[PDB]
Write a protein that binds this ligand. Structure first.
Ligand SMILES: [Zn+2]
Ligand SMILES: [Zn+2]
Ligand SMILES: [Zn+2]
Lengths: 261, 357, 441, 58
């Protein structure tokens, strides 16, 4: 419901679920290729298995240690022993019928263990939004809306960022200051940029497009002041920064400010 | 205050699109013409099956020349875009001439004589299929008339074709859904190619972008063209850049009323909109990404229906605005920065407020 | 000759005369620049051997490996022999100067060989093996490199001043004529149909060059492979015909000899299979010649002053067309329909208006900026003038910047009107039609 | 319908001939209306005209 509210409120609430999770959230049809988004290692294992299935020597591989319809469940599933196929304990896995089992294996984790959670999530989502508005979307649109940009990037910040100055002492100095600020911000890695935007607009995930930001970004470059930290407000997400002729001191102080939560 | 040939041509093309759409919509009434027109409007003209089929071959025989013109133009531009993509994925970004070079954007940031000589040389080379290693000189933004006529003909095809209307190894669970399927092309085999090429989006969770092509998002599909198991003019692959040879190609290509059963055969072969779209996939996506302020408003446009991410998000945002303007209650939340009390207050308030049998 | 004598006596047990001669005259795996004939054609003499010491115009290469920089400059002759493999490069700004690699490195070009023996060796190596079909390290055939050397030498050797009759002893000897080898070499190499076929057909489905993105396509998908396979290569061919028609204005016998050789090759009857090959060679050559003629006729202006009635480049093109009339007219018709189809199909790409040169000197520009370009190199392995802005609601005109980057090469956003581009294309078509009519008459 | 489709096809070909022949007379850009009143307008000037009157007397 909070995800759907963030959708309705045109806000980005970063909860980046797996592809199949949101695909079944929408009430679409799950498929096998989503296993690639699920766990690439196990997807590659199943792909190699299905490739060997075509080869006539696969049963010879089955003669190595006598594979069967039994797998070692991880501690995530809760332990214990769950039979994959009824009356399949004695029956070994055969290449002539592995494909079906392979499909089962997918739903053995995509759906068998994850029926109630995804079902409840979709049911809750359906009770806050209409069915008609739900369609025309997919996993990619939902991901670009909820998570916003997959990471926090400086170029999309430049896409929606307006600078104004109430002093106008020098345009060249203003340009040099903003160039230095953007240059130092660009060198920031993932998490620090996340915190920087968490102080910029209180959300590390930038809006997907120009639309998505309910207020218009605005940063006022005030005349220089020796002791004045930049101020930020989330009502319009506006910033006020002094014309810091000294660079690194301002950089470090804003870094420690955005470090604080 | 401009008087530009292109906008006059575009307006003529829009008129043509509207009249062609009206023709197609009228023809959609043929199967139920004995219940939609001949029984509702007190003034109606009787129609006969043989006259109907004669009329249909008449409309085909009248639309053939502009259809051939559109096929030639779209085939040439799609071939040039495909060659551009192939050379971009096969050329050094270092050289100034490469496609994926910041100097070839021509929109974010040279002489007129140079430009015209480049266009003349590009045409001279493209005619005799001699266009290797140097990009074509084409302005896909200067074909808005082609865009409108292509849209009109595609609408006609889709209307009439819709009016007409597997297990084990190819199990239903091992087949892509609408999320990843590409119309007009055989989906790539989910087994031979690995994850790094078949589904590149799984490998890198950061390939998503507001400007993200579905191709690199979900790999390159394949199409059954060229002379291999094909003996048709349309089935011959589009690997030919020019428009003179691509003009002699399609030129040399040559009972109750409720069962009218349109055929759309047109160019001697059964035409399905999926394969036709697959032929011009690059140009279709480029048209959807360049021309959208004008061709988008046209009802039932192929670009709007097959629009990129921006169309989807804009439509959903407009729907959000529409659905948000009739409620009477806000969130009215009251939470705290902690963890445990935050969750407890969230669950208690959301259950108490929005909870009832 | 000793190698021929040795190779004539060999056991053919998985061996051949050619497989035992190529591997001993230019062994396999060798770098292209070590190919004997390219070394033969790039030997010449250093500029200092005729420029004296004072600044006389000549191109300027810097040899960073051997230290020559910042008023220490090595010429183009020494950039292939003395500095073969250094981090040499070309300076965009080229003030007049003179070569000084002799005093800073070992200029192995100080003295020349024997000219008659040089011509004889060129003869023998051309008639002997197929080393002429391989490009040098820059992906250009021997003929194209030879023609570019001829074009440069024609404009640079007029500066030679005879030693008119009217302290320093360590200076290199500087009393010999500039190299005359390029002209003779081109004249002798234009008469070997193997070389001519290689040059004109360069860029075909079979022939490929390392300095071309079409060489390595194996790793690409089949669709990209076929799309890149269909298109033949013509950048090198256009370069060759441009340099032979427009640039080397000093001499006219070069194209006369070329046309003589092509005429000898088209009429052959005894040798089988030569008709189709010579027809294809002449067709591609005439297509490229038509391209050059069309461009350098479009750029020029039909000025009534001085009643010149014919310029030199279009004059060479006219002589070529007259020499090969039956096929020249067919190729010209093909080029004409090429030029005119977009005019009548309603797709004339917009182009801004432009002026026209009053003389051929300005006409040579643009043509030089376009023809003298090199193909896109392959993709290896798998003060700031442009500032950035942060603005919103910047929507003036626009409509072409929202497309994905991979295609934005083909989409554009002081008139640039459809009609003037259509008119210019129509004028080109009219020029082609007028030439067709004058030939047919 | 049977004759309406024929006449519409003829009209469409009439309009499209310059587009596929490249002979169109240039025209300046304009903004489409959004109301039926402006749909009636403009059309009023286009349609409601009288022919060229004859030259009187000789
Ligand atoms: Zn030198
Ligand atoms: Zn050196
Ligand atoms: Zn030297």
């Amino acid at each position: 419901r909070i995800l759907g509210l963030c959708l309705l409120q045109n806000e980005l609430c970063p909860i980046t679920l797996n592809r199949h999770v949101i695909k079944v959230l929408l009430g679409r049809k799950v498929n096998w290729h989503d296993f690639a988004f699920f766990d690439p290692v196990m997807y590659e294992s199943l792909r190699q298995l299905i490739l060997a299935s075509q080869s006539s020597d696969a049963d010879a591989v089955f003669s190595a240690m006598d594979l069967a319809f039994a797998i070692d469940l991880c501690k995530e599933e809760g332990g214990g022993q769950v039979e994959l196929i009824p009356n399949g304990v004695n029956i070994p896995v055969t290449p002539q019928n592995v494909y079906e089992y392979v499909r089962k294996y997918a739903e053995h984790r995509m759906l068998v263990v994850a029926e109630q959670p995804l079902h409840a999530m979709r049911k809750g989502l359906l009770d806050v939004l209409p069915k008609n508005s739900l369609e025309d979307l997919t996993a990619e649109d939902f991901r670009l809306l909820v998570n916003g940009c997959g990471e926090v990037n400086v170029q999309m910040l430049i896409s929606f960022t307006s600078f104004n100055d109430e002093s106008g002492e020098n345009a060249e100095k203003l340009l040099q200051f903003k160039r230095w600020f953007w240059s130092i911000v660009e060198k920031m890695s993932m998490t620090e940029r996340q915190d920087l935007v968490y102080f910029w607009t209180s959300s590390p995930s930038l809006p997907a497009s120009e639309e998505g930001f309910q207020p218009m970004p605005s940063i006022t470059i005030r005349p220089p002041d020796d002791q004045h930290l930049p101020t930020a407000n989330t009502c319009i997400s506006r910033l006020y920064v002094p014309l810091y002729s000294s660079k690194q001191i301002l950089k470090q102080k804003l870094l420690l400010a955005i470090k604080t939560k | 205050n401009a008087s530009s040939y292109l906008t006059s041509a575009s307006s003529l093309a829009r008129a043509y699109s509207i009249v062609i759409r009206q023709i197609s919509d009228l023809m959609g009434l043929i199967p139920k013409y004995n219940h939609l027109v001949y029984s509702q409007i007190p003034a109606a003209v009787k129609l006969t099956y043989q006259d109907a089929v004669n009329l249909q071959n008449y409309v085909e025989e009248k639309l053939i020349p502009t259809w051939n013109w559109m096929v030639s133009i779209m085939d040439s531009t799609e071939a040039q875009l495909r060659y551009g993509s192939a050379l971009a994925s096969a050329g050094d970004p270092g050289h100034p001439n490469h496609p994926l070079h910041a100097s070839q954007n021509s929109a974010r940031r040279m002489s007129a004589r140079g430009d015209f000589l480049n266009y003349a040389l590009s045409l001279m080379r493209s005619h005799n299929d001699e266009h290797s290693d140097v990009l074509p000189v084409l302005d896909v933004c200067s074909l808005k008339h082609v865009a409108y006529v292509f849209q009109a003909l595609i609408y006609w095809i889709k209307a009439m074709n819709q009016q007409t209307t597997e297990t084990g190894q190819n199990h239903p669970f091992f087949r892509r859904s609408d999320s990843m399927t590409f119309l007009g092309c055989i989906p790539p085999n989910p087994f031979e190619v690995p994850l790094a090429e078949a589904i590149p989006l799984a490998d890198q969770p950061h390939l998503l972008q507001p400007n993200a092509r579905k191709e690199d998002l979900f790999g390159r599909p394949s199409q059954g063209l060229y002379s291999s198991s094909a003996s048709s003019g349309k089935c011959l692959m589009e690997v030919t850049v020019d428009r003179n040879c691509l003009e002699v190609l399609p030129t040399k290509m040559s009972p109750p009323l409720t069962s009218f059963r349109p055929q759309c055969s047109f160019m001697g072969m059964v035409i399905s909109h999926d394969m036709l779209l697959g032929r011009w996939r690059l140009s279709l996506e480029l048209f959807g990404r360049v021309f959208m302020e004008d061709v988008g408003a046209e009802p039932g446009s192929i670009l709007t229906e097959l629009g990129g991410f921006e169309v989807k998000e804009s439509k959903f945002r407009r729907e959000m605005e529409k659905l948000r303007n009739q409620q009477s209650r806000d969130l009215s939340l009251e939470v705290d920065r902690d963890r445990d009390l935050l969750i407890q207050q969230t669950m208690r308030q959301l259950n108490n407020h929005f909870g009832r049998r | 000759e000793t190698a021929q004598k040795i190779a004539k006596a060999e056991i053919s047990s998985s061996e051949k005369e050619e497989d035992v001669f190529m591997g001993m005259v230019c062994p396999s795996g060798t770098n292209p620049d070590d190919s004997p004939l390219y070394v033969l054609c790039c030997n010449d003499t250093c500029s200092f051997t005729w420029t004296g010491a004072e600044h006389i115009n000549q191109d300027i290469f810097e040899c960073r490996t051997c230290g020559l920089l910042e008023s220490l400059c090595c010429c183009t002759e020494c950039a292939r022999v003395c500095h073969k493999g250094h981090d040499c490069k070309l300076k965009r700004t080229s003030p007049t100067a003179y070569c000084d690699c002799w005093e800073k490195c070992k200029c192995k070009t100080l003295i020349a060989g024997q000219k008659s023996a040089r011509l004889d060796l060129l003869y023998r190596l051309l008639t002997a093996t197929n080393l002429v079909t391989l490009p040098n390290s820059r992906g250009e055939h021997l003929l194209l490199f030879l023609v570019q050397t001829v074009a440069r030498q024609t404009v640079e050797h007029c500066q030679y001043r005879p030693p008119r009759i009217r302290e320093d002893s360590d200076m290199p000897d500087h009393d010999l004529e500039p190299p005359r080898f390029a002209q003779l070499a081109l004249e002798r190499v234009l008469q070997d149909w193997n070389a001519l076929k290689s040059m004109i057909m360069f860029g075909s489905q079979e022939n490929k060059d390392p300095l071309s993105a079409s060489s390595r396509i194996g790793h690409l998908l089949p669709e990209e492979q076929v799309y890149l396979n269909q298109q033949s290569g013509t950048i090198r061919l256009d370069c060759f015909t441009h340099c032979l028609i427009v640039k080397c204005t000093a001499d006219i016998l070069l194209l006369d000899t070329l046309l003589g050789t092509l005429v000898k090759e088209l009429q052959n009857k005894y040798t089988p299979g030569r008709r189709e090959e010579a027809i294809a060679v002449t067709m591609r050559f005439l297509r490229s010649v038509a391209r050059v003629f069309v461009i350098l006729s479009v750029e020029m202006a039909s000025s009534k002053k001085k009643n010149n009635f014919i310029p030199q480049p279009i004059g060479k093109c006219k002589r070529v067309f007259q020499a090969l009339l039956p096929y020249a007219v067919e190729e010209l018709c093909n080029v004409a329909e090429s030029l005119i189809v977009p005019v009548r199909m309603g797709i004339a790409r917009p182009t801004a208006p432009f002026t026209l040169a009053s003389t051929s000197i300005d006409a040579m520009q643009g043509s030089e900026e376009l023809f003298s370009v090199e193909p896109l190199p392959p993709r290896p392995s798998s003060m700031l003038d442009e500032p950035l802005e942060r603005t919103t609601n910047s929507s003036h005109a626009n409509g072409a910047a929202q497309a994905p980057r991979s295609m934005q090469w083909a989409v554009r956003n002081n008139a640039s009107s459809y009609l003037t581009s259509a008119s210019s294309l129509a004028r080109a078509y009219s020029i082609v039609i007028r030439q067709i009519s004058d030939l047919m008459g």
